[PDB]
Coordinates of all heavy atoms in Angstrom, one line a residue:
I202 N 29.5 26.0 91.6 CA 29.2 24.8 90.8 C 28.0 25.2 89.9 O 26.9 25.3 90.5 CB 28.9 23.6 91.7 CG1 30.2 23.2 92.4 CG2 28.5 22.4 90.8 CD1 30.1 22.0 93.3
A203 N 28.2 25.3 88.6 CA 27.1 25.7 87.7 C 26.0 24.7 87.7 O 26.2 23.5 87.5 CB 27.6 25.9 86.3
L204 N 24.8 25.1 87.9 CA 23.6 24.3 87.8 C 22.5 25.0 87.0 O 21.3 25.2 87.4 CB 23.0 24.0 89.2 CG 22.0 22.8 89.3 CD1 22.5 21.6 88.6 CD2 21.7 22.5 90.8
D205 N 22.9 25.6 85.9 CA 22.0 26.3 85.0 C 21.1 25.2 84.3 O 21.6 24.5 83.4 CB 22.8 27.1 84.0 CG 23.4 28.3 84.6 OD1 22.9 28.9 85.6 OD2 24.6 28.7 84.2
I206 N 19.8 25.2 84.7 CA 18.9 24.3 84.1 C 18.0 25.1 83.2 O 17.2 25.9 83.7 CB 18.1 23.5 85.1 CG1 19.0 23.0 86.3 CG2 17.4 22.3 84.5 CD1 18.3 22.3 87.4
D207 N 18.0 24.8 81.9 CA 17.2 25.6 80.9 C 15.7 25.3 81.2 O 15.3 24.1 81.4 CB 17.6 25.2 79.5 CG 19.1 25.2 79.3 OD1 19.7 26.1 79.9 OD2 19.6 24.5 78.4
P208 N 14.9 26.3 81.1 CA 13.4 26.1 81.2 C 12.9 25.3 80.0 O 13.4 25.3 78.9 CB 12.8 27.5 81.3 CG 13.9 28.3 80.5 CD 15.2 27.7 80.9
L209 N 11.8 24.6 80.3 CA 11.1 23.8 79.3 C 10.4 24.7 78.3 O 9.6 25.5 78.7 CB 10.1 22.8 79.9 CG 9.4 21.8 79.0 CD1 10.5 21.0 78.2 CD2 8.5 20.9 79.7
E210 N 10.8 24.6 77.0 CA 10.3 25.5 76.0 C 8.8 25.2 75.8 O 8.3 24.1 75.9 CB 11.0 25.3 74.7 CG 10.9 24.0 74.0 CD 11.8 22.9 74.6 OE1 12.5 23.2 75.5 OE2 11.7 21.8 74.1
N211 N 8.0 26.3 75.5 CA 6.6 26.2 75.3 C 6.3 25.5 74.0 O 7.0 25.6 73.0 CB 6.0 27.6 75.3 CG 4.5 27.6 75.1 OD1 3.7 27.3 76.0 ND2 4.1 27.9 73.8
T212 N 5.2 24.8 73.9 CA 4.7 24.0 72.8 C 3.3 24.3 72.5 O 2.4 23.9 73.4 CB 5.0 22.5 73.0 OG1 6.4 22.3 73.0 CG2 4.4 21.7 71.8
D213 N 2.9 24.9 71.4 CA 1.6 25.1 71.0 C 1.1 23.9 70.1 O 1.5 23.8 69.0 CB 1.4 26.4 70.2 CG 1.8 27.6 71.1 OD1 1.5 27.6 72.3 OD2 2.4 28.5 70.5
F214 N 0.3 23.0 70.7 CA 0.0 21.8 70.0 C -1.0 22.1 68.8 O -1.9 22.8 69.0 CB -0.7 20.8 71.0 CG 0.3 20.1 71.9 CD1 0.2 20.4 73.3 CD2 1.2 19.2 71.4 CE1 1.1 19.8 74.1 CE2 2.1 18.6 72.3 CZ 2.0 18.9 73.6
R215 N -0.7 21.5 67.7 CA -1.5 21.6 66.5 C -2.7 20.8 66.6 O -2.8 19.7 67.3 CB -0.7 21.2 65.3 CG 0.6 21.9 65.1 CD 0.7 22.7 63.9 NE 0.0 22.1 62.8 CZ 0.5 21.2 62.0 NH1 1.7 20.7 62.2 NH2 -0.2 20.7 61.0
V216 N -3.8 21.3 66.0 CA -5.0 20.5 65.8 C -4.9 19.7 64.5 O -5.3 20.1 63.5 CB -6.3 21.4 65.9 CG1 -7.5 20.5 65.8 CG2 -6.3 22.2 67.1
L217 N -4.2 18.6 64.6 CA -4.0 17.7 63.4 C -5.3 17.1 62.9 O -6.1 16.7 63.7 CB -3.0 16.6 63.8 CG -1.6 17.1 64.1 CD1 -0.7 15.9 64.5 CD2 -0.9 17.8 63.0
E218 N -5.4 17.2 61.6 CA -6.6 16.6 60.9 C -6.1 15.7 59.8 O -5.4 16.1 58.9 CB -7.5 17.7 60.3 CG -8.7 17.3 59.6 CD -9.5 18.4 58.9 OE1 -8.9 19.5 58.7 OE2 -10.6 18.2 58.6
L219 N -6.4 14.4 59.9 CA -5.9 13.4 59.0 C -6.8 13.5 57.7 O -6.2 13.7 56.6 CB -6.0 12.0 59.6 CG -5.2 10.9 58.8 CD1 -3.8 11.3 58.7 CD2 -5.3 9.6 59.5
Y220 N -8.1 13.2 57.8 CA -9.0 13.3 56.6 C -9.8 14.5 56.7 O -10.5 14.8 57.8 CB -9.8 12.0 56.6 CG -9.1 10.7 56.6 CD1 -9.0 10.0 57.7 CD2 -8.4 10.3 55.4 CE1 -8.3 8.8 57.7 CE2 -7.7 9.1 55.4 CZ -7.7 8.4 56.6 OH -7.0 7.2 56.6
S221 N -9.9 15.3 55.7 CA -10.8 16.5 55.6 C -12.2 16.0 55.5 O -12.5 14.8 55.2 CB -10.4 17.4 54.5 OG -10.4 16.7 53.2
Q222 N -13.2 16.9 55.7 CA -14.6 16.5 55.7 C -15.0 16.1 54.3 O -15.9 15.3 54.1 CB -15.4 17.7 56.2 CG -15.5 17.9 57.7 CD -16.2 16.7 58.3 OE1 -15.9 16.4 59.5 NE2 -17.2 16.1 57.7
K223 N -14.4 16.7 53.3 CA -14.7 16.3 51.9 C -14.3 14.8 51.7 O -15.1 14.0 51.1 CB -13.9 17.1 50.9 CG -14.1 16.8 49.4 CD -13.3 17.6 48.5 CE -13.5 17.2 47.1 NZ -12.7 18.1 46.1
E224 N -13.2 14.3 52.1 CA -12.8 12.9 52.0 C -13.7 12.0 52.8 O -14.1 10.9 52.4 CB -11.4 12.7 52.4 CG -10.4 13.5 51.6 CD -8.9 13.1 51.9 OE1 -8.7 12.1 52.5 OE2 -8.0 13.9 51.4
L225 N -14.1 12.5 54.0 CA -15.0 11.7 54.8 C -16.4 11.5 54.2 O -17.0 10.5 54.3 CB -15.2 12.4 56.2 CG -14.0 12.2 57.2 CD1 -14.3 12.8 58.5 CD2 -13.7 10.7 57.4
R226 N -16.9 12.6 53.5 CA -18.1 12.5 52.8 C -18.0 11.6 51.5 O -18.9 11.0 51.0 CB -18.7 13.8 52.5 CG -20.2 13.8 52.1 CD -20.7 15.2 51.9 NE -22.2 15.3 51.9 CZ -23.0 15.0 50.9 NH1 -22.5 14.6 49.7 NH2 -24.3 15.0 51.0
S227 N -16.8 11.7 50.9 CA -16.5 10.9 49.7 C -16.0 9.5 49.9 O -15.7 8.8 48.9 CB -15.5 11.7 48.8 OG -15.9 13.0 48.6
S228 N -16.0 9.1 51.2 CA -15.5 7.7 51.5 C -16.7 6.7 51.6 O -16.6 5.8 52.4 CB -14.7 7.7 52.8 OG -15.6 8.0 53.9
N229 N -17.8 6.9 50.9 CA -18.9 6.1 50.9 C -19.3 5.6 49.6 O -19.3 6.4 48.6 CB -20.1 6.8 51.6 CG -19.9 7.0 53.1 OD1 -19.6 6.1 53.8 ND2 -20.2 8.3 53.5
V230 N -19.7 4.3 49.5 CA -20.2 3.8 48.2 C -21.6 4.4 47.9 O -21.9 4.7 46.8 CB -20.3 2.2 48.3 CG1 -20.5 1.7 46.9 CG2 -19.1 1.7 49.0
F231 N -22.4 4.5 49.0 CA -23.8 5.1 48.8 C -23.8 6.5 49.6 O -23.4 6.6 50.7 CB -24.8 4.2 49.4 CG -24.9 2.8 48.8 CD1 -24.2 1.8 49.4 CD2 -25.5 2.6 47.6 CE1 -24.2 0.5 48.8 CE2 -25.6 1.4 47.0 CZ -24.9 0.3 47.7

């Protein structure tokens, strides 16, 4: 009775960045 269970594939999580530092510095009135 076949019970071939595939291993869980590896996942390299990205370091997601929404706003770059330039936008963060440019998001100010003053």
